[PDB]
Amino acid sequence: LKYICAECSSKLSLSRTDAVRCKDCGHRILLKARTKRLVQFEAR
Amino acid sequence: LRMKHGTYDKLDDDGLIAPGVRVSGEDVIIGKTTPISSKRDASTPLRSTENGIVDQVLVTTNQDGLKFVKVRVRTTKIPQIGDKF
Amino acid sequence: ATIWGVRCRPGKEKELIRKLLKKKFNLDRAMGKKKLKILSIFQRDNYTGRIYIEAPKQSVIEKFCNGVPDIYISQKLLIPVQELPLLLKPNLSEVALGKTVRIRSAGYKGQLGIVKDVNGDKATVELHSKNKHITIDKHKLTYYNREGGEGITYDE
Amino acid sequence: SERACMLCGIVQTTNEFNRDGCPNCQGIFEEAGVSTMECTSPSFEGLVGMCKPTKSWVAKWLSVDHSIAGMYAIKVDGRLPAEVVELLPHYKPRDGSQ
RNA sequence: UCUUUUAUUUUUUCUG
Ligand SMILES: [Zn+2]
Ligand SMILES: [Zn+2]
């Protein structure tokens, strides 16, 4: 997964040279999901 | 060309930093190249006096069709002595 | 001799005289026996921003130049008789950098961080829980792959 | 497209020359046997929006007072042909020469 | 064997 939608909240996994339009809907905010990287945070 | 002092390893292949990764000091968050008639980068580094976590990132197209990006960075401010109340 | 110079916007002397003169044929066709007292209108390419009209009275010229856009009728001067022959003379003119790492005997134990700069014998890492850079020797720190998982010491 | 006559200075479209020739110089041009294309030129400066031949003192200087109200250039580059220069002794060059 | 960038002005906001 690379990117996700706003309303449908569906994954796109698109690449460059592609329109930012969503496929399920015309709504195209096109959020980007969290990185695969493991993240450390301490309660301090 | 002229790149910034920020570390470019964090940036993804699309050139945009994903949420959940730290950006600190002058670390770049948006990777920009401004070709004219060699890549001639024109990125926007992070503020030197700011540190935090990239909270959200949004990519859209403006009315002209050009690509628009908005990157929200989150940090926690705990009270210190100099804090005003 | 009644030749008066009038200011107007530069670059359109041709077009302003065109509009004036076309208007004048339209008027002269329209009127009957009485026809308005304008004798000649002209300009010069060398002297831009201005036109020169020869007519007997200021109200005649004003009445004529009503309805013409862009003409600055408010600036007119009566050119003295001596200046006219000269004006009308025919002849003018390392692998540890940028990697994720953990500390294992220090006050900041268990802190993930990212290697930013190394000065030799000591590496600077930004704490992944706090907003600070800290300097600590690399041989004593453990390096991982991009993704969390198998851990290796400083031997890559 | 615009062309300027070299004798009387009347300026107008090359088209309207091709239809009606030179209204002021038609007789002289026919008598000399020269078409208006040669006695007109495209290069001209110093226009005149011309109204009163009999009353314009600018026209008295420029030798237009015997012509019709019209469209006259103070300069029109070129040398007039001899077959009309001889027949109009009172003419003078319009380029400022002579 | 070092160097290496952070436009300008007009406005507004508040801080002491
Ligand atoms: Zn959608
Ligand atoms: Zn003629």
Swiss-Prot record, chain A:
GO terms for molecular function: DNA binding; DNA-directed RNA polymerase activity; zinc ion binding. It is found in: Nucleus, Nucleolus; Peroxisome. Keywords: DNA-directed RNA polymerase, Metal-binding, Nucleus, Peroxisome, Ribosome biogenesis, Transcription, Zinc, Zinc-finger. GO terms for cellular component: cytoplasm; nucleolus; nucleoplasm; nucleus; peroxisome; RNA polymerase I complex; RNA polymerase II, core complex; RNA polymerase III complex. The N-terminus is blocked. Zn(2+) binds at C5, C8, C22, C25. Its main location: nucleus. It comes from the Eukaryota. Coiled coil: none annotated. GO terms for biological process: nucleolar large rRNA transcription by RNA polymerase I; ribosome biogenesis; RNA-templated transcription; termination of RNA polymerase I transcription; termination of RNA polymerase III transcription; transcription by RNA polymerase I; transcription by RNA polymerase II; transcription by RNA polymerase III. The keyword Metal-binding applies. A zinc finger (C4-type) spans 5-25. DNA-dependent RNA polymerases catalyze the transcription of DNA into RNA using the four ribonucleoside triphosphates as substrates. Common component of RNA polymerases I, II and III which synthesize ribosomal RNA precursors, mRNA precursors and many functional non-coding RNAs, and a small RNAs, such as 5S rRNA and tRNAs, respectively. RNA polymerases are composed of mobile elements that move relative to each other. In Pol II, the core element with the central large cleft comprises RPB3, RBP10, RPB11, RPB12 and regions of RPB1 and RPB2 forming the active center. Component of the RNA polymerase I (Pol I), RNA polymerase II (Pol II) and RNA polymerase III (Pol III) complexes. Component of the RNA polymerase I (Pol I) complex consisting of 14 subunits: RPA135, RPA190, RPC40, RPA14, RPB5, RPO26, RPA43, RPB8, RPA12, RPB10, RPC19, RPC10, RPA49 and RPA34. The complex is composed of a horseshoe-shaped core containing ten subunits (RPA135, RPA190, RPB5, RPO26, RPB8, RPB10, RPC10, RPA12, RPC19 and RPC40) where RPA135 and RPA190 form the DNA-binding cleft. Present with 907 molecules/cell in log phase SD medium. This is DNA-directed RNA polymerases I, II, and III subunit RPABC4. It comes from Saccharomyces cerevisiae (strain ATCC 204508 / S288c) (Baker's yeast).
From Swiss-Prot, chain B:
Coiled coil: none annotated. The modification Phosphoserine is found at S37. It is found in: Nucleus. Belongs to the RNA polymerase beta chain family. The binding of ribonucleoside triphosphate to the RNA polymerase II transcribing complex probably involves a two-step mechanism. The initial binding seems to occur at the entry (E) site and involves a magnesium ion coordinated by three conserved aspartate residues of the two largest RNA Pol II subunits. Present with 18700 molecules/cell in log phase SD medium. DNA-dependent RNA polymerase catalyzes the transcription of DNA into RNA using the four ribonucleoside triphosphates as substrates. Second largest component of RNA polymerases II which synthesizes mRNA precursors and many functional non-coding RNAs. Proposed to contribute to the polymerase catalytic activity and forms the polymerase active center together with the largest subunit. Pol II is the central component of the basal RNA polymerase II transcription machinery. Component of the RNA polymerase II (Pol II) complex consisting of 12 subunits. This is DNA-directed RNA polymerase II subunit RPB2.
